[PDB]
């Protein structure tokens, strides 16, 4: 809608207070005009028709329980917008400031979130396995990053290309988390996962095997489940990215870490300039080596570490 740009206040899923960019026209809407062609959040009202209703509030204050997922989907979309623009000089997910839209309160007890080709969708969780998934900034940035992949490399959501797709979403999810720098880690979804159990996570990049995911190519899954294991074999690439950033010795292979920022520069370049819809793990290593080479030179530590990292996950 057309309206006056305002700033509201409320708290998130985790009970934290934050300010949000709203739009005033009789009601206050969760529409942020300060980033690109807008960030828009909607109420799916526990149903599954999308996107639902543009979120409207009478007084611009968002402290109801019902408000919380909305507040966070809105806010972390903006943080995710800010990462791509400031860090990668990318304007929204399509690179031309496309409107970002999210729907929350999707279905009943929906233990998931996703990108559906046009927008982000977040369930509320069943309150046991999950709380409203928008509470995790790594979850939000994972979702939007799927959007980024779909407009760039277009990695098909199956087999190795699919695991690459997922891994990219986990890698940038994580980088954005470190970027907002609120308790960041190399784990996935911990803020909104299993409310009753501290310390766990949906997935781990540092040690994917923690949750039954492979950290070596020889342990790769090749059944037909989970689209040929896009959420399973992603661990092999996640581990690799973890290693490039952080370093370590994995199955006897030592990797010199080069930190988060260069990891992000190297994978963003691979994603946008080298990867394609059918790239496999092998092509990804080549893409990453070329990227690192592009960025730091053929004889750099960066190229070397990239190689070490894929070597360690058994990817040639």
Q: Is residue 160 flagged as an active site residue?
A: no
Residue 54 contacts residue 42 (beta carbons within 8 Å): yes
Looking at beta carbons, which residue is closest to Ca ion? 194
Q: For residue 198, give both structure tokens.
A: 């501290």
Cβ closest to Ca ion, residue 206 vs residue 272: 206
Question: Which residue stretch of 71-79, 111-119, 150-158, 195-203 sits at the interface with Ca ion (rule: CB under 5 A)?
Answer: 195-203
Angle 260-269/234-246 helices, nearest 10 degrees? Answer: 130
Is 166 assigned to a binding site?
Answer: yes
Residue 73 contacts residue 140 (beta carbons within 8 Å): yes
| 26 part of the interface to Ca ion, by CB under 5 A | no
Distances (CA, A) of 215 to 55, 199, 294: 42, 20, 27
Alpha-helix runs per DSSP H in the chain = 68-88, 137-151, 159-180, 225-229, 234-246, 260-269, 281-296, 301-312
| 170 part of the interface to Ca ion, by CB under 5 A | no
Q: How far is the CB of 143 from Zn ion (least distance, A)?
A: 7
Q: Is residue 216 flagged as an active site residue?
A: no
Closest among 229, 219, 109 to 164, alpha carbons compared:
229
Burial label, 183 (beta-carbon count in 10 A; 0-12, 13-18, 19+)? exposed
- Among candidate residues 74, 105, 160, 231, the one labeled active-site is 231
Beta-ladder partners of 5: 23
Question: Which residue stretch of 40-48, 103-111, 158-166, 260-268 sits at the interface with Zn ion (rule: CB under 5 A)?
Answer: 158-166
Q: Binding string to Zn ion for residues 167 to 186, with x set by CB under 5 A, is what?
A: --x-----------------
In the list Zn ion, Ca ion, none, the entry touching 213 (Cβ below 5 to 8 angstroms by class) is none
303 vs 42: CA distance, rounded Å: 44
Question: Which residue stretch of 104-112, 134-142, 162-170, 208-216 sits at the interface with Ca ion (rule: CB under 5 A)?
Answer: 134-142
Binding-site member from 38, 54, 57, 248 for Ca ion (CB under 5 A): 57
Looking at beta carbons, which residue is closest to Zn ion? 169
Three-class SS of residue 49?
coil
Is 61 assigned to a binding site?
Answer: yes
| Residues near Ca ion (CB under 5 A), total | 11
Binding site for Zn ion (CB under 5 A): 166, 169
Which parts are annotated binding residues for Ca(2+)? 57, 59, 61, 138, 177, 183, 185, 187, 190, 193-194, 197, 200
Give the residue numbers marked as catalytic.
143, 231
């Amino acid at each position: 809608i057309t309206g006056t740009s305002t700033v509201g206040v409320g708290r998130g899923v985790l009970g934290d207070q934050k300010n949000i960019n709203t739009t005033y026209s009789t009601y206050y809407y969760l529409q942020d005009n300060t980033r690109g062609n807008g960030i828009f959040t909607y109420d799916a009202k526990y149903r599954t028709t999308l996107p639902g209703s543009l979120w409207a509030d009478a007084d611009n204050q968002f402290f109801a329980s019902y408000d919380a997922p909305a507040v966070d989907a809105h806010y972390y979309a903006g943080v995710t917008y800010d990462y791509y623009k400031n860090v990668h000089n990318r304007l929204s997910y399509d690179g031309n400031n496309a409107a970002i839209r999210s729907s929350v309160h999707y279905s009943q007890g929906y233990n998931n979130a996703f990108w559906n080709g046009s927008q982000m969708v977040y369930g509320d969780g069943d309150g046991q396995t999950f709380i409203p998934l928008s509470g995790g900034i790594d979850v939000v940035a994972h979702e939007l990053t799927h959007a980024v992949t779909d407009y760039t490399a277009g990695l098909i959501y199956q087999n190795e290309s699919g695991a690459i797709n997922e891994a990219i979403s986990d890698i940038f999810g994580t980088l954005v988390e470190f970027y907002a720098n609120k308790n960041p880690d190399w784990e996935i979804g911990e803020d909104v996962y299993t409310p009753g159990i501290s310390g766990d996570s949906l997935r781990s990049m540092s040690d994917p095997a923690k949750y039954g995911d492979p950290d070596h190519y020889s342990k790769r899954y090749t059944g037909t489940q989970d689209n040929g294991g896009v959420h399973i074999n992603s661990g092999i690439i996640n581990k690799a990215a973890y290693l490039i950033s952080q370093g370590g010795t994995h199955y006897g292979v030592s990797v010199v870490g080069i930190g988060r920022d260069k990891l992000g520069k190297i994978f963003y370049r691979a994603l946008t300039q080298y990867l394609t819809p059918t790239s496999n793990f092998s092509q990804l290593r080549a893409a990453a080596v070329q990227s690192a080479t592009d960025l730091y030179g053929s004889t750099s530590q960066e190229v070397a570490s990239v190689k070490q990292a894929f070597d360690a996950v058994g990817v040639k």
